[PDB]
Design a protein around this ligand. Structure first.
Ligand SMILES: NC(=O)c1ccc[n+]([C@@H]2O[C@H](COP(=O)([O-])OP(=O)(O)OC[C@H]3O[C@@H](n4cnc5c(N)ncnc54)[C@H](O)[C@@H]3O)[C@@H](O)[C@H]2O)c1
Ligand SMILES: NC(=O)c1ccc[n+]([C@@H]2O[C@H](COP(=O)([O-])OP(=O)(O)OC[C@H]3O[C@@H](n4cnc5c(N)ncnc54)[C@H](O)[C@@H]3O)[C@@H](O)[C@H]2O)c1
Lengths: 504, 504
């Protein structure tokens, strides 16, 4: 049990430098104010973008393996402060202590992955059709990387973008969610510590302005997306946010990494391991109070399994501990705020109007009118009606029955989102069909592991309204750089004159 | 010498099936009407998009090597009709006979390249951190591929997109420039011939509606870009077109391959091979009457070379034959239309107001008031002023002097476009600096080969206002498919209960 001021002190955060009376930093745990903060003006945001661009001009000529060493040092700083940073994630995002720790560990893991990439950043050498010419494809730092992040992963989304961007020779301007500024301040402070350690061993190499933190409301978010000095913006959030950002990027022909909403489903086929299913369903649907973008929200269960499987899931649901995420034993912490609670209860009301039968979903009183805890809900639906197609960012699992596998695929694919997906089956034919071109239409398509089944090494992102961006693994790093095709003529041969007078 | 009706007959085009009184197909050679055509209504366009989507649903499960066989057959059909199709390109786009032939040969070359890709389409198998799990990245046909193309490469741009899209399991809906419909009709007719040959050896495999041709004005172009059944649109044209298309794509969170304008420059450094430079400059600047998107428009010449080099370029310029592109000896055919001529003369007027000294640029009378031939212009400019930053799609080469190499790079990079670029030097240090992160900012960056130096095997496209899309070589094919990250759990191990009641 570390108090809030102990956390700040252990992170070496001096709140006096960030205090103000513009932005209230609230804890979902009890609704209490953690601190009140100053915010950037639009002009402040522009100035920070100018400084990040100057930083980029220096950083882009630093050898990438040297750039990776800063990221390696940053990984070690995060390791040293993992417990306190994780606790801050719990206080501000409301997730249980182990998920706070787990989210910081994701930051650390991507640092080490990016260190590996810092010795790669592979283009190609390519055969040329021209005699005495050589051809290659090279990759180059692109410029300032804007990062717009959501409340629910307040540190790992930024780390995923910044580790890659720094290794790729970019500076970063970060505008975190106005709901989670304190975790962002902490990350920024820990980065400054990394830069100080790196400056000891690499004097003059890293620009002090490499990472920028912009705190505030829509006005500074709009400065960032409209800035002609920011050639790529990674934007994580709602579908509506992504549409608006993409419109601004398009107007100035800039690049987007769009990581928008999910509405993730699982098909449970007749041969599924039910002992495995009941656990995988429960944990993916109720984890983080249904506030992961990969949260399981749709369950498509074969008719032969309903009578066996559903009472087991209901039994697990009822035994899940909802409570303050600081307590040992808690599995489900609070929803982030009232708007989230209201949208949940509205979704459930819609579900009932649409023929659904709701279990769970009621509010859990913890003694605070401005803290919103709920029992996870599981809703038997006669079809995948309008409410099921909405992403309600809350623990609601809609259950639909299917008979024919092709029909289950169609139902699975019929929502407008396309982030993650899973099939539980032991039949290799169904598993492969689900992963095939006519199967799941999502960016993440898993077999016998739930919809949060993803790791550093894989490209992370989705299709359809999820926006098409990819982060983290595979060659996602290319989105932080610009491709060049180079043809080099080392021949002394002159082109044919074609009757043109070239003689001296 | 093949007459127009001979060309149609040899291509097996029955004009009676395409004739109408909506769209006039005009030849830039003499301004004459070649034919008057029917056009698609918005509803026609929607119906064709529906048919292409149905075609996609069938084609996406055809093995890619089988899909490549259709493209191989298409390549052979193009070989058989190369002379006549090339002649049609000359009549409609106005380029000289060898460039008409050369453009069709690009279609043929990309077919064979796509045949190779049809046995690849590589994703990854990737280590997983989870015991008893396997992870991989797979690629899948994405859906209908919209293709919007420009007048000046009326057949190769479509071929570049369609060869890859077909091999990648996509259908194609093509809306060619309203300025070059007849070349598009020919390509579509030749594709139908390929489908008939393929149907003999592969009965029932390829959907008849795999390729669609949409002829008409903005109204059908806007149906295509707004269609929710078209997940990717490849758009080749002006910067303004690309901005408008990208806005529509963004609103529905769809993917763009944007191939917009260039404003391509060459740095000539003190050690350059001047015999080589004078030829490379002349051919890249005046070729196709300055109507390539890679046309050389800006020359940044070291002061020590000006007195030697510029009279040699002027001498070559004056000897260039401007005339009807059907004539042997012609190097420079006509501008496409009056609007192009007027914009050229306006640019030259602006250049003079901005201190420039113009040579060439006057109209060449060929006896037709509606045919626009010009002498290529070369303009000595005191600086890279406002007119030089505009892309004027005409043969105007602006010449700026430089002293310091870093300053030349800044001037080279100061325009808003970013397609292709070149440095002519024998100094390896300058050549590498130009290709480095702080060098040319373009998508194509060449050494001792001009700004049209590109080939099938390289990714083709640019940065900045050029829009960021890539076509043809390297892994450009990924833009026609959707990535999936697959994690497969084949372990029998249950997750920890975490105190949740899972027992039966
Ligand atoms: N795809 C992913 O990787 C991923 C990861 C985490 C969360 N999410 C999604 O995020 C959502 C939950 O996060 P949220 O509630 O914070 O979303 P949100 O859209 O309300 O806000 C996300 C961020 O965008 C900013 N923003 C909003 N509108 C903006 C605009 N027009 N211009 C500039 N900035 C703007 C916000 O200030 C915030 O920083 C869910 O839909 C969830 O699925 C997706
Ligand atoms: N980047 C490349 O690979 C490449 C290749 C060839 C040409 N170009 C560029 O193309 C331009 C010359 O071609 P152009 O004069 O035909 O260009 P353009 O922009 O006038 O037209 C291109 C195509 O877009 C269509 N179009 C225009 N506005 C549209 C809209 N709002 N919605 C839908 N469709 C729309 C036109 O009908 C035509 O088919 C130059 O700028 C040149 O640099 C680029």
């Amino acid at each position: 049990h570390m108090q809030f001021n102990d956390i700040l002190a252990a992170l070496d955060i001096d709140l006096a430098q960030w205090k103000g009376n513009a932005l209230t930093a609230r804890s979902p745990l009890d609704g209490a104010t953690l601190a009140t903060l100053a915010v950037d003006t639009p002009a402040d945001a522009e100035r920070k973008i100018d400084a990040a661009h100057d930083a980029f001009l220096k950083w882009r000529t630093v050898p990438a393996p040297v750039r990776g060493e800063l990221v390696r040092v940053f990984g070690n700083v995060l390791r040293e402060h993992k417990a306190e940073l994780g606790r801050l994630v719990t206080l501000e995002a409301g997730k249980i202590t182990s998920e706070g720790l787990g989210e910081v560990q994701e930051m650390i893991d991507i640092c080490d992955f990016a260190v590996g990439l810092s010795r790669q950043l592979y283009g190609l050498t390519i055969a040329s059709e021209r005699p005495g010419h050589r051809m290659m494809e090279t990759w180059h730092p692109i410029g300032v990387c804007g990062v717009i992040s959501a409340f629910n992963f307040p540190v790992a989304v930024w780390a995923w973008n910044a580790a890659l961007a720094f290794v790729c020779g970019d500076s970063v301007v970060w505008k975190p969610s106005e709901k989670t500024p304190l975790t962002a301040i902490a990350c920024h402070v820990l980065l400054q510590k990394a830069l100080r350690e790196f400056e000891k061993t690499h004097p003059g190499v890293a620009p002090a302005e490499l990472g920028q933190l912009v705190l505030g409301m829509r006005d500074v978010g709009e400065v960032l997306t409209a800035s002609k000095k920011v050639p790529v913006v990674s934007a994580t959030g709602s579908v509506r946010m992504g549409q608006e950002v993409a419109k601004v990027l398009s107007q100035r022909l800039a690049r987007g990494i769009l990581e928008l909403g999910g509405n993730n489903g699982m098909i449970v086929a007749p041969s599924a391991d039910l002992d495995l299913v009941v656990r995988a369903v429960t944990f993916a649907a109720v984890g983080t109070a249904g506030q992961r973008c990969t949260t399981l929200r749709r369950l498509i269960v074969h008719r032969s399994l309903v009578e066996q499987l559903l009472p087991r899931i209901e039994k697990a649901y009822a035994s899940v501990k909802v409570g303050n995420p600081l307590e040992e034993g808690t599995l489900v912490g609070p929803l982030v705020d009232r708007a989230s609670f209201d949208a949940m209860q509205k979704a459930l009301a819609d579900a009932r109007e649409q023929g659904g039968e709701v279990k769970g979903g009621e509010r859990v009183d913890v003694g605070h009118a401005d803290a919103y805890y709920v029992r996870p809900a599981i809703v038997r639906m006669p079809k995948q009606s309008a409410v099921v197609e909405r992403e309600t960012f809350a623990p609601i699992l809609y259950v639909m029955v299917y008979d024919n596998f092709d029909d289950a695929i169609d139902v699975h694919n019929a929502v407008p989102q396309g982030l993650s997906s899973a099939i539980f089956t032991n039949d290799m034919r169904e598993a492969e069909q689900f992963m095939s071109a006519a199967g799941s239409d999502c960016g993440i398509v898993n077999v016998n592991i739930g919809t949060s089944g993803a790791e550093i090494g894989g490209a992370f992102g989705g299709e359809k309204e999820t926006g098409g961006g990819r982060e983290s693994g595979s060659d996602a790093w290319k989105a932080y750089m610009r491709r060049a095709t180079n043809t080099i003529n080392y021949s002394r041969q002159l082109p044919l004159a074609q009757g043109v007078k070239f003689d001296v």
